[PDB]
Design a binder for this molecule. Structure first.
Ligand SMILES: *C(=O)/C=C/c1ccc(O)cc1
Length: 119
């Protein structure tokens, strides 16, 4: 599955942990409050977070404070509310990691996905 695929949520709906860990891009699944449900190996490779220990933490409050902004969190919340989350933008991740430019794709699951790749 490619980053930004039109039907990416269909493909990932079928996937187990190892399968998610085999993706070419970082993949995070959040509930509507931003708590982390899933977090793959590729994401940990970008961020330095241990995927096994971030599960259950709040993405916006505790893991990724730099994403607590209108440009990221605000877009998440709008898409949770509208029921149509499917949005793509550039961002920089810089909390407890080397500042790293990424592309982000947020999309509602068949739970909400946050997909990340380096740029
Ligand atoms: C800004 O603080 C971003 C941090 C971050 C982004 C994504 C991750 O998976 C974890 C940390």
């Amino acid at each position: 599955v490619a980053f930004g695929s039109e039907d990416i949520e269909n493909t990932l709906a079928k996937m187990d942990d190892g399968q998610l860990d085999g993706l070419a891009f970082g993949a995070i699944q959040l509930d509507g409050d931003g708590n982390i449900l899933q977090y793959n190996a590729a994401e940990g490779d970008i961020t330095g977070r241990d995927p096994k220990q971030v599960i259950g933490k709040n993405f916006f409050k505790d893991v990724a404070p730099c994403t607590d902004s209108p440009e990221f969190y605000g877009k998440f919340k709008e898409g949770v509310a509208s029921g149509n989350l499917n949005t793509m933008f550039e961002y920089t991740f810089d909390y407890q990691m080397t500042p790293t430019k990424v592309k982000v794709h947020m999309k509602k699951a068949l739970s909400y996905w946050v997909f990340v790749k380096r740029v």
